RNA sequence: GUUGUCGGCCAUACUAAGGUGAAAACACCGGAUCCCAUUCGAACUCCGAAGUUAAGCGCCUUAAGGCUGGGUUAGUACUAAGGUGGGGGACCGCUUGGGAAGUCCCAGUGUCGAUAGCCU
């Protein structure tokens, strides 16, 4: 249990994803030179498990392995404004148990971390897919007009109301719970 | 720079068609009385010195074949350890380690000697 700063105060409303910077260098490592300096963005909860996501990345796009190379840094990126909402998209490739998929992916919240958490139990979910399955191609904040899903254009307007239709009776505290109680609830 | 003699490694030395050839050697070359030799002096043996680089041989030539070394191939195939991983299964994949080979590329193409010499 170790919280990212930009995480919510109740652990409950999110995963546990942040976003990385990893970058190392081919292991020779000769003083004076100009390094070439392997760098990339992977999403993972753990600097461990960054680590982990970025040389798998690398070896598979790349002819280096661990013994081959060093880790110069681990930096966890954080995103700008807590305060708005945002359409995000993401590019993913994962595995499903005839084939590989490369998916786009859109959703609406306040993080890049929340977009991912959120496409994480999606894919899980409607898709049955594995975490550690999951690539993550490309993702970009979206600009109005390059916003191209159903689900994420549903919410743009101004006028929205949902009436609150049922209220699933949940007191406030444990210290109000009673099994059976003396009249019945209501919904609105 | 070049030669014979005996060589270690045994193609980067082999194969094919060519150019070239100072000197000295090596050879091709001349001849069968003698030791030796065969169906045959071809060869093997012996004795030589009229010719000759034409052979052998040195050195090089080929968008040459081969061989040698790297590149791609490819972190692919295969593989070590773990898995109350997925899949009806065949099988696939997650974590931590090793990691190849042919097509196609590019380069190389004999090296190390002891001994006596040629180039005054
Ligand atoms: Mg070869
Ligand atoms: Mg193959």
């Known amino acids: 249990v170790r919280k990212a700063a930009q995480e919510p105060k109740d652990d409950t409303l999110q995963m546990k994803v942040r976003q990385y910077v990893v970058s190392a260098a081919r292991l020779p490592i000769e003083q004076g030179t100009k390094p070439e300096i392997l760098q990339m963005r992977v999403f993972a909860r753990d600097e461990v498990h960054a680590k982990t996501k970025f040389w798998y990345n690398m070896r598979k796009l790349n002819k280096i392995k ?3 190379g060093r880790i110069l840094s681990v930096n966890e990126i954080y995103e700008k404004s807590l305060n708005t909402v945002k359409t995000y998209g993401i590019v993913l490739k994962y595995q499903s148990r005839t084939a590989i998929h490369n998916m786009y992916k859109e959703y609406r919240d306040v993080s890049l971390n929340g977009a991912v958490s959120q ?5 899980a ?5 594995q975490p550690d399955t999951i690539q993550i191609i490309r993702t970009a904040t979206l600009e109005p007009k390059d916003i191209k899903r159903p689900a994420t254009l549903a919410m743009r307007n101004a006028a929205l109301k949902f009436p609150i239709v049922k209220t699933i009776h949940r007191p406030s505290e444990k210290k109000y719970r009673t099994v059976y109680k003396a009249t019945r609830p209501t919904t609105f």
Request: proline share 0%; net charge positive.
């Open 119 to 123: 496409l994480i139990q999606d894919m």
């Open 125 to 129: 979910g409607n898709h049955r897919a």
């Open 66 to 68: 661990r013994s081959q």
